[PDB]
Scaffold this active site. Structure first.
Site, mmCIF file in Angstrom:
data_model
loop_
_atom_site.group_PDB
_atom_site.id
_atom_site.type_symbol
_atom_site.label_atom_id
_atom_site.label_comp_id
_atom_site.label_asym_id
_atom_site.label_seq_id
_atom_site.Cartn_x
_atom_site.Cartn_y
_atom_site.Cartn_z
ATOM 1 N N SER A 187 -30.860 33.991 28.748
ATOM 2 C CA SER A 187 -29.862 33.138 28.975
ATOM 3 C C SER A 187 -29.108 33.649 29.930
ATOM 4 C CB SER A 187 -28.971 33.183 27.744
ATOM 5 O OG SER A 187 -29.435 32.516 26.717
ATOM 6 N N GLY A 188 -28.616 32.576 30.921
ATOM 7 C CA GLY A 188 -27.913 32.845 32.224
ATOM 8 C C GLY A 188 -28.791 33.115 33.452
ATOM 9 N N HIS A 224 -22.212 29.902 28.506
ATOM 10 C CA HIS A 224 -22.304 30.407 27.008
ATOM 11 C C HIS A 224 -22.547 32.105 27.158
ATOM 12 C CE1 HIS A 224 -27.036 30.240 26.883
ATOM 13 N NE2 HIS A 224 -26.954 31.260 26.033
ATOM 14 N N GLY A 253 -31.625 36.162 24.922
ATOM 15 C CA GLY A 253 -31.496 37.526 26.003
ATOM 16 C C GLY A 253 -31.930 37.177 27.529
ATOM 17 N N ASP A 288 -23.431 24.258 31.251
ATOM 18 C CA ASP A 288 -23.596 25.543 30.878
ATOM 19 C C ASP A 288 -23.661 26.498 32.319
ATOM 20 O OD1 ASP A 288 -23.741 27.770 29.348
ATOM 21 O OD2 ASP A 288 -25.848 27.480 28.603
#
Ligand SMILES: [Ca+2]
Length: 224
Positions: free
Chosen positions: A177-178, A40, A175, A84
């Protein structure tokens, strides 16, 4: 990260910031040329910023390197957030040092109750927004399958796990994320999704990195 603490400069040396004129996602450095982040987080124009603490000040130790490849899992499903995961190849190899270091991929999956370290420059408030200058950190355990699925009926696949705290107050957030979930020195999770942040009975949900190791190895091998 809500309810965490200041990591301290470069104490999470595999933590990267993904930047498109502003910080928008985290990632994890897995070797000098590749970063693991969330599907994402994909966009064009990605700059990878390694060696960061204060993401708003040039402090020394920063290395900025453009992504030359951004590879979203072919089965990534956006509505369901399944698979994801994204690999980013850097235009040139990073200089590896005490402050910029790769994190190991798992050799097996982690278990429920395992304590992990989740980190990021994401929102620090579960109600409204506040973004930190410096990297934040949270210790959180992996939850059982049953608890995760009770928390999120319908929504939990086998490429997902819950981690964190059902009482609320301690979570990753927008923020983050990942970014990394690292347990016993292995990258087991990728900050993926959750319902709000740090809400009661709604823990963070994370990409299950142990299912993707061969895919990671294969994708890198064939993108030489
Ligand atoms: Ca900086």
């Amino acid at each position: 990260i809500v309810g965490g603490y200041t990591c301290g400069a470069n104490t999470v040396p595999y933590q990267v910031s993904l930047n498109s004129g502003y910080h928008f996602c985290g990632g994890s450095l897995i070797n000098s040329q590749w970063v693991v982040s969330a599907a994402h987080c994909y966009k064009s124009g990605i700059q990878v910023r390694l060696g960061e603490d204060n993401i708003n000040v040039v402090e020394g130790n920063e290395q900025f390197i453009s992504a030359s490849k951004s590879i979203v899992h072919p089965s990534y499903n956006k509505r369901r957030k399944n698979n994801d995961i994204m690999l980013i190849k850097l235009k040139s190899a990073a200089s590896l040092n005490s402050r910029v270091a790769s994190i190991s991929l798992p050799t097996s999956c982690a278990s429920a109750g395992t304590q992990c370290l989740i980190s990021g420059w994401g929102n620090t408030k579960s109600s409204g927004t506040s973004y930190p200058d410096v990297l934040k950190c949270l210790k959180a355990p992996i939850l059982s399958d049953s608890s995760c699925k009770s928390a999120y009926p319908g929504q939990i696949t086998s490429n997902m796990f819950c981690a964190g705290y059902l009482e609320g107050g301690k979570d990753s957030c927008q923020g983050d994320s990942g970014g990394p979930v690292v347990c016993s020195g292995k990258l087991q999770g990728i900050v993926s999704w959750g319902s709000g942040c740090a809400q009661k009975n709604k823990p963070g949900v994370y990409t299950k990195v142990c299912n993707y190791v061969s895919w990671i190895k294969q994708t890198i091998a064939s993108n030489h």
